[PDB]
Amino acid sequence: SRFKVSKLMAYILRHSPWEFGLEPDEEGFVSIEELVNAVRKVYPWVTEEYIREIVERDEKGRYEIRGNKIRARYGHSYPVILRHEEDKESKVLYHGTVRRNLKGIMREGIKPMKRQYVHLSINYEDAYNTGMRHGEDVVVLIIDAECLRNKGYKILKAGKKVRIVKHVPVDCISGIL
Ligand SMILES: Nc1ncnc2c1ncn2[C@@H]1O[C@H](COP(=O)(O)O)[C@@H](O)[C@H]1O
Ligand SMILES: Nc1ncnc2c1ncn2[C@@H]1O[C@H](COP(=O)(O)O)[C@@H](O)[C@H]1O
Ligand SMILES: [Cl-]
Ligand SMILES: [Cl-]
Ligand SMILES: [Cl-]
Ligand SMILES: [Cl-]
Ligand SMILES: [Cl-]
Ligand SMILES: [Cl-]
Ligand SMILES: [Cl-]
Ligand SMILES: [K+]
Ligand SMILES: [K+]
Ligand SMILES: [K+]
Ligand SMILES: [K+]
Ligand code: NA
Questions:
Q1: 94-117 burial by CB neighbour count: b if 16+ within 10 A, else e?
Q2: Is the shortest distance between the CB of 154 and ligand 2 below 6 Å?
Q3: Per its UniProt record, what InterPro entries does this chain match?
């Protein structure tokens, strides 16, 4: 299924390319032909056309293809440089997290923790669902993106809904949901 193959694509492109003999470039790109070869080690019926269809149909915009190169746009667990188009349109964004982080966030802002980018979403439901990944005490922070930009932070379009930024200062958090 698309769900099973996309799950393997995401694992290879974000977390363990070397396991499949792929070496991502500094921006996380690998040869799409080599990704087909890697994926067919699990799912031999997969084709390059299929992988391209998965990219086109992915509801989050998880994947990006440029020429012969394919990458995950966000979510890597290894170091990657992500030079995505700037989001200049959003005025409000959302950050889903858990209540236990509020004390630290309220003093320090939203900080990069292991990855070098803070993850935001244009969609409140998406942020809520993403916060649920860290537990049941979910809170969603409303972020004044215009304020973020005015402070000189560039917000990049990493998916259809995901947005990335270096840091969210406390005074850009307008509310807690
Ligand atoms: N079910 C999940 N629970 C927790 N973290 C996840 C889950 N799925 C993916 N992740 C992590 O969150 C990132 C984004 O997932 P997604 O936005 O669904 O592509 C992944 O690259 C992983 O780092
Ligand atoms: N200052 C902070 N104190 C505590 N937790 C934070 C802080 N800044 C960010 N976080 C959390 O760190 C986590 C990073 O998740 P991810 O960006 O998916 O790796 C999210 O749950 C954030 O809400
Ligand atoms: Cl690996
Ligand atoms: Cl693309
Ligand atoms: Cl990321
Ligand atoms: Cl990049
Ligand atoms: Cl680039
Ligand atoms: Cl979020
Ligand atoms: Cl997550
Ligand atoms: K995609
Ligand atoms: K990648
Ligand atoms: K506090
Ligand atoms: K984050
Ligand atoms: Na997370």
A1: bbbbeeebeeebeeeebeeeebeb
A2: no
A3: Ptrans_KptA/Tpt1, RNA_2'-PTrans_C, RNA_2'-PTrans_KptA, RNA_2'-PTrans_N
